[PDB]
Amino acid sequence: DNFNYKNDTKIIFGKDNYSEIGKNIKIFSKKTPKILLHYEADGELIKKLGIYEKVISSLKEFDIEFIELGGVVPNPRLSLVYEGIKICKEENITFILAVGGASVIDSAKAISLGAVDNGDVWDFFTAKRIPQDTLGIGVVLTIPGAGSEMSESSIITDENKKQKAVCDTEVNFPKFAILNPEVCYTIPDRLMAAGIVDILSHLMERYFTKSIDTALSDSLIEATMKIVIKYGPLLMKDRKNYNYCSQIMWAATMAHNGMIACGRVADWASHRIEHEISGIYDLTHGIGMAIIFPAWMKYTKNIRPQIFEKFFKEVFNTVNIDEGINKLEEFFKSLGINLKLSDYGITEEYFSLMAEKALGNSETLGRFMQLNKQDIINILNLAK
Amino acid sequence: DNFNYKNDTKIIFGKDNYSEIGKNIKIFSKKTPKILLHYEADGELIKKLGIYEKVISSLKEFDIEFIELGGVVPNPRLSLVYEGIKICKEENITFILAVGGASVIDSAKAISLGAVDNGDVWDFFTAKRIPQDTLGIGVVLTIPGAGSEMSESSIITDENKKQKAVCDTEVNFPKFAILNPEVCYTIPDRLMAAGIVDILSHLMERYFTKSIDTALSDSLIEATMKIVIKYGPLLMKDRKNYNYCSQIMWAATMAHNGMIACGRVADWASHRIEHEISGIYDLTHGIGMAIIFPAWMKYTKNIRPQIFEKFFKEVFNTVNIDEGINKLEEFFKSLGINLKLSDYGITEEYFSLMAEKALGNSETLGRFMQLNKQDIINILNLAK
Ligand SMILES: Nc1ncnc2c1ncn2[C@@H]1O[C@H](COP(=O)(O)OP(=O)(O)O)[C@@H](O)[C@H]1O
Ligand SMILES: Nc1ncnc2c1ncn2[C@@H]1O[C@H](COP(=O)(O)OP(=O)(O)O)[C@@H](O)[C@H]1O
Ligand SMILES: [Co+2]
Ligand SMILES: [Co+2]
C-alpha cells in the first residue's frame, strides 16, 4: 500500500471572478499571450449562458489577442485536433483556453501536445512516443463531470480508422481550471441528477476495495460520499442554490483527487457492465450507474461484508446491508431516477450479448469480486 | 468564499522504496545530475537511523554524483545558506536533497533559490525581489510535522542582525517529498505526542471559523481530526505499528492541504498565546497547544455555539460542549500530556507579560473572537 501523488492543475474556485481568465492566462503564457479559444460546435451553449461574453471581456481587459476554433463533437475528432495544431503553429498561439466540458478539454489537451511537437500527435495516443512538453491550457469548466479539468488524460477518436484512443501523461495537466458552481444552474434536471450519481459512483468504485489499512482514506471518501448524499437531493429541488452547488461541484473535484484515494484498488465492474448497456441503448451513464451499482452490491455483499457494514454505517447510519442498500436506492429515486432497466424499455434480450462484450477476451471481470459471464447476467437480472 | 489551490510537490508515500530517492532525483534534475546532500549537524541522526546508508545506496545505484553539506541548527542560519549557494555555483549542483526536517528543508529551499539567482537571496526574504526560479529540491522527511516538505515557505534567521524572516512563493515547492511512516518509529515519546497535537491543532485552527457554507470542507477536516483522535493514542502505545503510523503521518500531510480547507478563515489565537509561553519557558509547541486550545475553546464557546456543537458531535459523539471539551482533554492526557501550566512549573507570573507580547502593537487578537489583553489573561488562567 505505497502510492505516489502529483497534481499541479491550479484550481480557481468561486464566482464573480471572471477577471481570472485573463489574469491566469498571463501567469501561464509565454511573454506576450495570444490564445486559442476552444468550445463545442459554434459557441451556442457558452454564448447562450453568457460565458462567451464574460470571457471576451476578460481577454480584452488584459489585452490578450485570440483566435476562435469551434466545432467539437461529444467524442472529439482527431481531424479537428489536426486543424488546431495547424493554427497554433501558423498563428503562434502561446496558450489554449478550453471553455466547455471534457469533449472540448480533450481537444484542448490534444492540440496543446502537438502545437509543441514536430511530428504526428497520434504517436502520443497510439503509444509510439511519450510527449515531453505541451503548450499549456486553462479550462473554463461548464459541467462538473469526468474531471478532465484536472486529469492527465485525453480521449480522441480518429474517425477515418474509427479507433478511439487515449494519452495519459503529466504534461496533459491543465495549467489552471476555472470552477464556478453557478454553471450548474442551467444544466437540465436528468443530466444533473446523473452527474450526481457519477460523483458518488467514482467514490464507491474506489471505496469498495479488498485493500487493507486504509482508515484515513476510508473517512475522507466516506465524508465526500456522505455530502453527495445530503446535498445531491437538495440541489435537485433548489437548482439555483449556490451553496448546494458549491458542495456538489467541490465534491466532484475531490472525487477525482487521489489524495483521498491513497492507492487503494478501484473496481470497474459496474462501469464495464453499464458501458455495455449504454452501447446498445440510448441511456445516460449516471442513470445506468444508479441501476447497476445497487445490483452489483447485492451480488458482491459476501466478499468483504465488514467493508459493506462500514459503508452503510458511515454513510447511511445503518449496520444492516439490506436496509442500507434500500436507502441507497431511495437516494437515487430522490434524484428523479427510476431504479430498473425494465423502466427504460430495456429487456433481458441482450443480457447475454452485453455480458460477453463486457468480458471481451477475459474469463472474469472486476477486482473486488471476479465476475464471469453468468455472474454478470445475474447482476443484470437483479437490475431488471 | 472563493479560493485558489495549487500544490505541485510530488508525494512518494510508503516504505521499502528507497530507490525512488535516485529515480526521482533523475526525473527532476537537469541532464546529468550532481546533487547536494543537506542534513542537520553532521548526519548524526540520519546516519544513526540508517537513512544515510539507504540514501547513498540509491545515489550509487543511479550514478548520481553528490557533495555533502551539513550543520543545520534548529532555526537555520543564513550564513549556512550563503555557503550552500557558493558550493552550488562552484560545483555545479543541479539539485538538492533535503534529508531531515523543516530546519534542513528550509535551508534546502533557501539554497535552491540563490543557486539560480545572480544577487543576494536575503532580498527574497526581506521583500525586495520576488524569486522567479529555483534550482529544485527533493525531501527525505524524517519527522511528520510543520509540512515544509510540501509548503512554499522558508524561515531563515540571519544571526548577525538577529532578524528572522520568511519567503513564501510558488517556486519554494519541493519537486518531490519522500514520505515513509517508518521514520516515526524512532521518535521520542513526548516529541511524537506533541506532534500528534500539532496535526489536530492545525486542523482545529481552520475548523473553528466564522465562515459559512463549508459543509464538505467541514466533513473532510472532521474526518481527519477524528482519525488523529482514534489512531494518535494507539500509535503512542504501539510505536512500531506501520498502520498506525501511516494514518497519523498521512493525517499530517492532509492537515497541510488546502483542498480540505477551502479558503475558510483560520484563527491563530491559540498559536500566538502558546508562542509566548514557549518564548519564556522551555516548552514544546504541541504540549502548549494541548494546554492552550481547551482553554481557548472554553473562552470562545459562546461565539458560534453551533459550530462547537458540530465539532464535538462529529468528532467526539456528543452535543454537550462541556462533555466534549473534557473528552478532548482526556484525549490529550491519553497521549502522556499533562493538561495544566502549573504542572510544568509555569506560574501566573508572566501572564501579563505574555499577553502584551502576544498582542504586540494591536488592541485585540484572533478572528473567531477578538481577544484583548485581559481576554488573553483569562485564557491563561483557564490553563493554569
Ligand atoms: N453549464 C451547462 N449548462 C447546461 N448544459 C450543459 C452545461 N455544460 C455542458 N452542458 C451539456 O452537457 C452535454 C454533454 O456534456 P459535456 O459538455 O460533453 O461534458 P462531459 O463530457 O464532462 O459530460 C452537452 O451537450 C452540453 O449541452
Ligand atoms: N525520525 C526521527 N527520529 C527521531 N528523532 C527525530 C526524527 N526526525 C527528527 N527528529 C528530532 O526532532 C528534533 C526537532 O525536529 P526537527 O527535525 O527540527 O523537525 P521539525 O522542525 O519539522 O519539528 C530534532 O532535534 C531531531 O533530533
Ligand atoms: Co465511472
Ligand atoms: Co499551529
mmCIF file of C-alpha atoms in Angstrom, chain A residues 139-331:
data_model
loop_
_atom_site.group_PDB
_atom_site.id
_atom_site.type_symbol
_atom_site.label_atom_id
_atom_site.label_comp_id
_atom_site.label_asym_id
_atom_site.label_seq_id
_atom_site.Cartn_x
_atom_site.Cartn_y
_atom_site.Cartn_z
ATOM 1 C CA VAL A 139 -10.070 25.424 -18.630
ATOM 2 C CA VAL A 140 -13.343 27.237 -18.078
ATOM 3 C CA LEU A 141 -15.425 24.254 -16.989
ATOM 4 C CA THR A 142 -19.144 24.285 -17.752
ATOM 5 C CA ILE A 143 -20.220 20.894 -16.341
ATOM 6 C CA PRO A 144 -18.674 19.273 -13.161
ATOM 7 C CA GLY A 145 -18.187 15.761 -14.506
ATOM 8 C CA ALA A 146 -15.396 13.375 -15.515
ATOM 9 C CA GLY A 147 -12.746 15.695 -14.034
ATOM 10 C CA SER A 148 -10.732 16.247 -17.245
ATOM 11 C CA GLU A 149 -10.102 19.814 -15.978
ATOM 12 C CA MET A 150 -7.535 18.284 -13.606
ATOM 13 C CA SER A 151 -6.677 14.886 -15.207
ATOM 14 C CA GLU A 152 -3.699 13.892 -17.333
ATOM 15 C CA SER A 153 -5.887 12.099 -19.886
ATOM 16 C CA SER A 154 -7.162 12.962 -23.353
ATOM 17 C CA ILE A 155 -9.552 10.719 -25.297
ATOM 18 C CA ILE A 156 -9.639 11.363 -29.026
ATOM 19 C CA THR A 157 -11.435 9.292 -31.659
ATOM 20 C CA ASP A 158 -9.862 9.095 -35.127
ATOM 21 C CA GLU A 159 -12.904 8.595 -37.350
ATOM 22 C CA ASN A 160 -11.088 7.650 -40.567
ATOM 23 C CA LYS A 161 -9.845 4.439 -38.915
ATOM 24 C CA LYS A 162 -12.653 4.616 -36.258
ATOM 25 C CA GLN A 163 -10.184 3.657 -33.466
ATOM 26 C CA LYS A 164 -10.614 5.702 -30.280
ATOM 27 C CA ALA A 165 -7.508 6.113 -28.094
ATOM 28 C CA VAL A 166 -6.115 7.932 -25.048
ATOM 29 C CA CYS A 167 -2.890 9.559 -23.893
ATOM 30 C CA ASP A 168 -2.036 9.727 -20.173
ATOM 31 C CA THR A 169 0.950 11.866 -19.216
ATOM 32 C CA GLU A 170 1.840 14.532 -16.687
ATOM 33 C CA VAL A 171 2.078 17.183 -19.421
ATOM 34 C CA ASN A 172 -1.702 16.923 -20.051
ATOM 35 C CA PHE A 173 -2.416 18.610 -16.677
ATOM 36 C CA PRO A 174 -4.236 21.913 -17.359
ATOM 37 C CA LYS A 175 -2.227 24.811 -16.042
ATOM 38 C CA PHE A 176 -5.381 26.189 -14.405
ATOM 39 C CA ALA A 177 -9.074 25.299 -14.195
ATOM 40 C CA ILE A 178 -11.795 27.895 -13.539
ATOM 41 C CA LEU A 179 -14.501 26.386 -11.316
ATOM 42 C CA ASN A 180 -17.696 28.436 -10.860
ATOM 43 C CA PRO A 181 -20.607 26.494 -9.262
ATOM 44 C CA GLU A 182 -23.051 28.889 -10.969
ATOM 45 C CA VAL A 183 -22.568 26.978 -14.226
ATOM 46 C CA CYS A 184 -24.562 24.166 -12.583
ATOM 47 C CA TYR A 185 -27.783 26.265 -12.589
ATOM 48 C CA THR A 186 -28.629 25.846 -16.272
ATOM 49 C CA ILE A 187 -27.986 22.062 -16.503
ATOM 50 C CA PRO A 188 -31.118 20.008 -17.372
ATOM 51 C CA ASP A 189 -32.602 18.034 -14.476
ATOM 52 C CA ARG A 190 -31.941 14.470 -15.682
ATOM 53 C CA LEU A 191 -28.421 15.472 -16.748
ATOM 54 C CA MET A 192 -27.581 16.932 -13.351
ATOM 55 C CA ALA A 193 -29.019 14.016 -11.393
ATOM 56 C CA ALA A 194 -26.902 11.608 -13.452
ATOM 57 C CA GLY A 195 -23.899 13.806 -12.788
ATOM 58 C CA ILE A 196 -24.565 13.459 -9.067
ATOM 59 C CA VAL A 197 -24.576 9.678 -9.479
ATOM 60 C CA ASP A 198 -21.279 9.878 -11.354
ATOM 61 C CA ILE A 199 -19.585 11.568 -8.359
ATOM 62 C CA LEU A 200 -20.921 9.040 -5.830
ATOM 63 C CA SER A 201 -20.021 6.143 -8.162
ATOM 64 C CA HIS A 202 -16.488 7.421 -8.732
ATOM 65 C CA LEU A 203 -16.114 7.422 -4.937
ATOM 66 C CA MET A 204 -17.735 3.980 -4.400
ATOM 67 C CA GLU A 205 -15.570 2.283 -7.083
ATOM 68 C CA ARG A 206 -12.509 3.198 -5.046
ATOM 69 C CA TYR A 207 -14.156 2.720 -1.673
ATOM 70 C CA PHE A 208 -15.224 -0.930 -2.214
ATOM 71 C CA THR A 209 -11.765 -2.488 -2.152
ATOM 72 C CA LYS A 210 -10.026 -5.595 -0.864
ATOM 73 C CA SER A 211 -7.078 -3.363 0.186
ATOM 74 C CA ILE A 212 -6.424 -3.091 3.930
ATOM 75 C CA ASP A 213 -5.124 -0.445 6.380
ATOM 76 C CA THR A 214 -6.897 2.496 4.744
ATOM 77 C CA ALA A 215 -8.747 4.170 7.638
ATOM 78 C CA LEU A 216 -7.971 7.839 6.982
ATOM 79 C CA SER A 217 -8.669 7.255 3.297
ATOM 80 C CA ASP A 218 -11.956 5.478 4.175
ATOM 81 C CA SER A 219 -13.057 8.506 6.226
ATOM 82 C CA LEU A 220 -12.290 11.048 3.511
ATOM 83 C CA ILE A 221 -14.128 9.032 0.842
ATOM 84 C CA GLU A 222 -16.988 8.499 3.302
ATOM 85 C CA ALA A 223 -17.144 12.212 4.112
ATOM 86 C CA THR A 224 -17.355 13.130 0.417
ATOM 87 C CA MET A 225 -19.881 10.390 -0.349
ATOM 88 C CA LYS A 226 -21.999 11.497 2.608
ATOM 89 C CA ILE A 227 -22.007 15.085 1.239
ATOM 90 C CA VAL A 228 -23.177 13.920 -2.165
ATOM 91 C CA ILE A 229 -25.946 12.019 -0.324
ATOM 92 C CA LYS A 230 -27.055 15.024 1.752
ATOM 93 C CA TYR A 231 -26.748 17.818 -0.815
ATOM 94 C CA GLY A 232 -27.489 15.981 -4.087
ATOM 95 C CA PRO A 233 -31.234 15.753 -3.308
ATOM 96 C CA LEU A 234 -31.322 19.380 -2.123
ATOM 97 C CA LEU A 235 -29.585 20.723 -5.240
ATOM 98 C CA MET A 236 -32.172 18.825 -7.279
ATOM 99 C CA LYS A 237 -35.084 20.728 -5.705
ATOM 100 C CA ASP A 238 -33.349 24.147 -5.472
ATOM 101 C CA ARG A 239 -31.338 24.294 -8.703
ATOM 102 C CA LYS A 240 -30.085 27.877 -8.319
ATOM 103 C CA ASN A 241 -28.724 27.444 -4.773
ATOM 104 C CA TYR A 242 -25.033 28.407 -4.847
ATOM 105 C CA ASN A 243 -24.292 26.690 -1.517
ATOM 106 C CA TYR A 244 -25.820 23.414 -2.682
ATOM 107 C CA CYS A 245 -23.886 23.725 -5.974
ATOM 108 C CA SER A 246 -20.591 24.521 -4.215
ATOM 109 C CA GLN A 247 -20.776 21.339 -2.155
ATOM 110 C CA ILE A 248 -21.668 19.101 -5.103
ATOM 111 C CA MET A 249 -19.179 20.646 -7.531
ATOM 112 C CA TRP A 250 -16.447 20.622 -4.870
ATOM 113 C CA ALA A 251 -17.388 17.004 -4.051
ATOM 114 C CA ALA A 252 -16.878 16.132 -7.728
ATOM 115 C CA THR A 253 -13.460 17.779 -7.798
ATOM 116 C CA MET A 254 -12.401 15.931 -4.624
ATOM 117 C CA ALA A 255 -13.840 12.712 -6.055
ATOM 118 C CA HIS A 256 -11.143 12.983 -8.739
ATOM 119 C CA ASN A 257 -8.380 13.504 -6.149
ATOM 120 C CA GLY A 258 -6.012 10.708 -5.233
ATOM 121 C CA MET A 259 -5.088 12.374 -2.015
ATOM 122 C CA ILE A 260 -8.246 10.873 -0.592
ATOM 123 C CA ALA A 261 -7.836 7.581 -2.513
ATOM 124 C CA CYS A 262 -4.364 6.553 -1.347
ATOM 125 C CA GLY A 263 -3.573 3.935 -3.950
ATOM 126 C CA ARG A 264 -6.495 1.743 -2.955
ATOM 127 C CA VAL A 265 -7.533 -0.711 -5.656
ATOM 128 C CA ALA A 266 -10.563 0.512 -7.625
ATOM 129 C CA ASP A 267 -13.107 -1.875 -9.130
ATOM 130 C CA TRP A 268 -14.608 -1.063 -12.539
ATOM 131 C CA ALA A 269 -17.076 -3.977 -12.678
ATOM 132 C CA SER A 270 -20.110 -1.646 -12.557
ATOM 133 C CA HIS A 271 -18.598 0.763 -15.073
ATOM 134 C CA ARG A 272 -17.925 -2.012 -17.595
ATOM 135 C CA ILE A 273 -21.395 -3.578 -17.232
ATOM 136 C CA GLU A 274 -23.010 -0.135 -17.536
ATOM 137 C CA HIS A 275 -20.844 0.668 -20.569
ATOM 138 C CA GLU A 276 -22.402 -2.252 -22.458
ATOM 139 C CA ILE A 277 -25.968 -1.272 -21.549
ATOM 140 C CA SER A 278 -25.130 2.184 -22.865
ATOM 141 C CA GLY A 279 -23.546 0.719 -26.008
ATOM 142 C CA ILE A 280 -26.814 -0.920 -27.073
ATOM 143 C CA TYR A 281 -29.386 1.500 -25.537
ATOM 144 C CA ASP A 282 -29.586 5.276 -25.512
ATOM 145 C CA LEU A 283 -29.012 5.575 -21.754
ATOM 146 C CA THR A 284 -27.022 8.170 -19.804
ATOM 147 C CA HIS A 285 -24.015 6.940 -17.813
ATOM 148 C CA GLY A 286 -25.111 8.257 -14.400
ATOM 149 C CA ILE A 287 -28.577 6.724 -14.766
ATOM 150 C CA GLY A 288 -27.035 3.368 -15.635
ATOM 151 C CA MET A 289 -24.799 3.506 -12.597
ATOM 152 C CA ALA A 290 -27.793 4.136 -10.355
ATOM 153 C CA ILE A 291 -29.363 0.962 -11.760
ATOM 154 C CA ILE A 292 -26.211 -1.181 -11.896
ATOM 155 C CA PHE A 293 -24.361 -0.293 -8.720
ATOM 156 C CA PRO A 294 -27.076 -1.466 -6.274
ATOM 157 C CA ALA A 295 -27.321 -4.721 -8.249
ATOM 158 C CA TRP A 296 -23.524 -5.192 -8.118
ATOM 159 C CA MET A 297 -23.517 -4.526 -4.375
ATOM 160 C CA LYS A 298 -26.226 -7.134 -3.792
ATOM 161 C CA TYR A 299 -24.210 -9.686 -5.761
ATOM 162 C CA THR A 300 -20.878 -8.893 -4.003
ATOM 163 C CA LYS A 301 -22.268 -8.445 -0.463
ATOM 164 C CA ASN A 302 -20.485 -11.597 0.719
ATOM 165 C CA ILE A 303 -16.885 -10.796 -0.333
ATOM 166 C CA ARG A 304 -15.994 -8.314 2.446
ATOM 167 C CA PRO A 305 -19.209 -7.836 4.439
ATOM 168 C CA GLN A 306 -17.410 -5.725 7.043
ATOM 169 C CA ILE A 307 -16.479 -3.095 4.475
ATOM 170 C CA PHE A 308 -20.136 -3.154 3.464
ATOM 171 C CA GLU A 309 -21.184 -2.794 7.097
ATOM 172 C CA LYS A 310 -18.776 0.133 7.362
ATOM 173 C CA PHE A 311 -20.027 1.872 4.181
ATOM 174 C CA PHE A 312 -23.688 1.822 5.184
ATOM 175 C CA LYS A 313 -22.863 2.721 8.819
ATOM 176 C CA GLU A 314 -20.808 5.824 7.996
ATOM 177 C CA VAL A 315 -22.889 6.929 5.032
ATOM 178 C CA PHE A 316 -26.470 5.827 5.791
ATOM 179 C CA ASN A 317 -26.354 5.295 9.585
ATOM 180 C CA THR A 318 -27.202 1.574 9.485
ATOM 181 C CA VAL A 319 -25.249 -1.661 10.011
ATOM 182 C CA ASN A 320 -27.883 -3.619 8.041
ATOM 183 C CA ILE A 321 -26.633 -4.087 4.459
ATOM 184 C CA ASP A 322 -30.172 -4.728 3.146
ATOM 185 C CA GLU A 323 -31.610 -1.634 4.812
ATOM 186 C CA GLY A 324 -28.581 0.326 3.648
ATOM 187 C CA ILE A 325 -28.940 -0.907 0.067
ATOM 188 C CA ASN A 326 -32.596 0.147 0.003
ATOM 189 C CA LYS A 327 -31.606 3.558 1.411
ATOM 190 C CA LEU A 328 -29.181 3.993 -1.440
ATOM 191 C CA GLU A 329 -31.907 3.000 -3.888
ATOM 192 C CA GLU A 330 -34.222 5.546 -2.233
ATOM 193 C CA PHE A 331 -31.497 8.165 -2.539
#
